[PDB]
Amino acid sequence: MQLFVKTLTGKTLTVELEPSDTVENLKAKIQDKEGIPPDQQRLIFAGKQLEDGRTLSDYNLQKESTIHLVLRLRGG
């Protein structure tokens, strides 16, 4: 399926990932397209941050959704 992603620039991205895939994989796509490190991408879908190792189907990702990708902010 397709998934829409946005950053701190308002740029919308389009990637192809299955509900079986895991966050880790998603990050890989962000690296193969935008070239951004996995730990440098904060996916806050619906307000919740995706954990590296969980499957899209383990959260609630539907066909063509929207996620806010923010850079890791100081702290931890």
CATH class membership: Alpha Beta
Terminal-residue CA separation: 32 Å
Taking the sheet with the most strands, its summary is: 5 strands, mixed
Looking at the overall shape, the CATH architecture is: Roll
Total domain units: 1
> Which range best describes the helical content: under 10%, 10-25%, 25-40%, 40-55%, 55-70% or over 70%?
10-25%
Radius of gyration, CA atoms, in whole angstroms? 11 Å
Work out the helix count.
Answer: 1
**Percent range for β-strand residues:** 25-35%
CATH topology: Ubiquitin-like (UB roll)
| Secondary-structure element pattern, one letter each | EEHEEE
C-alpha geometry: globular
Cross-sheet strand order for the largest sheet:
2-1-5-3-4
DSSP strand tally: 5
Cross-link (Glycyl lysine isopeptide (Lys-Gly) (interchain with G-Cter in ubiquitin)): 6, 11, 27, 29, 33, 48, 63
Site (Essential for function): 68
Cross-link (Glycyl lysine isopeptide (Gly-Lys) (interchain with K-? in acceptor proteins)): 76
Modified residues ((Microbial infection) ADP-ribosylthreonine): 66
What layout of secondary structure does this protein have?
Layout: E1 2-6, E2 12-16, H1 23-33, E3 42-45, E4 48-49, E5 66-70
Parallel strand pairs: 1-5
Antiparallel strand pairs: 1-2, 3-4, 3-5
Organism: Homo sapiens (Human)
Domain Ubiquitin-like: 1-76
Cross-link (Glycyl lysine isopeptide (Gly-Lys) (interchain with K-? in acceptor proteins)): 76
